[PDB]
Assembly symmetry: C2
Homo-oligomer: 216 residues x 2
């Protein structure tokens, strides 16, 4: 357990953080890249220095079944990380980069077990370009300005997310739970929504988008 410690400009080695739990820690411009962070736990930790805008590097990290809870991961570089079983909950993640990060197994074996759990996060202006976020728990996130181009969210729970005006046509939504989501500009004629779950109060916006006039 590493508690209430400040690390500045530190390039972490594997033995520094092997199986370690971090609580209340601050990482300023630290480099964790290509380390095995599997099953690590970070709670109430900051990885972004607000005054200097320094971010941390976690490129190519094994993040499998790692857990981040209420952390500031603003501008964190998680590109090329292994993220199967990653848990990110209630984290500030503005601009987080997951380009080339693997989440779901290409051999998706359909069940009610989630392949990852990213809930309650701010993912505004994040980069999930090309990512396979299939059969994941992804509810309660904010996604405004996020790059989801060529990504797949197939089979995922997105309920209660705030998307803003996403390029809906470039992301696979098949089988998603989109209940209690704003879906502005989503066009049924242009976007495949097979297996998609919505509430009855979401119907009217979708149908009006294609020119229907809905009455009580």
């Amino acid at each position: 357990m590493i508690k209430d410690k400040c690390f500045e400009g530190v390039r972490f080695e594997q033995q520094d953080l092997e199986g370690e739990q971090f609580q209340g820690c601050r990482f300023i411009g630290c480099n964790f890249s290509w380390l095995d962070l599997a099953e690590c736990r970070f709670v109430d930790c900051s990885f972004y220095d607000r005054e200097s805008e320094q971010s941390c590097l976690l490129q190519g990290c094994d993040l499998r079944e790692a857990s981040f809870l209420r952390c500031d991961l603003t501008m964190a570089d998680c590109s090329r990380s292994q993220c199967l079983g990653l848990e990110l909950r209630d984290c500030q993640a503005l601009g987080i980069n997951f380009s080339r990060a693997s989440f779901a197994n290409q051999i998706t074996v359909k069940s009610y077990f989630c392949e990852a759990h990213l809930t309650g996060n701010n993912f505004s202006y994040a980069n999930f370009e090309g990512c396979l976020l299939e059969q994941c728990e992804l509810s309660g996130n904010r996604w405004q300005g996020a790059n989801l181009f060529g990504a797949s969210l197939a089979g995922s729970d997105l309920s209660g997310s705030e998307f803003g005006q996403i390029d809906w046509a470039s992301v696979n939504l098949q089988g998603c739970d989109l209940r209690q989501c704003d879906l502005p500009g989503l066009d049924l004629r242009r976007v495949n929504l097979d297996g998609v779950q919505i509430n009855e109060d979401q119907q009217q916006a979708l149908l009006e988008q294609i020119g229907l006039i809905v009455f009580p």
Copy 2:
């Protein structure tokens, strides 16, 4: 007023029915073709013999502002007829033929005044191929197996209609009131529904058609 009269195999001339009103009359294999029936009025009349299956011919008739109320117009040939202002209310009209009949004017000056009133009729297996049924009152009709190929119902009121499974993509439905209609097999990815009016309770069936799962 001509009342309770039977006409067998009569080829009608203009003098016979000029500005005339018919009640409770029977017409068995009669020819009205090419006559001016404008503003003529038929109430509780039969134009179809149910044993012999003899129908009447009304090809190229002026039917402008004519009215047929509770008439049996089964298999009537009304092709090439003029029909601006025609009123058919509550008629049995299985297999009626309106091909090449003119309803709405192409000089379609948009208002809340209907070009024609056809309500409460059985139009099952009718032929309205090519017809301009635009800005018309067309409610409460049954249309099962009707040919609506190349027709326009644009701007018309079809509410309370029973359609069965019509070739939805070959008929113009823009601006139509489709409230209280069962709309089976209507696919919003393939059918322009711009300006169409539906009730809230019709949304689920349209959405389910394209793969969505609607919950309370």
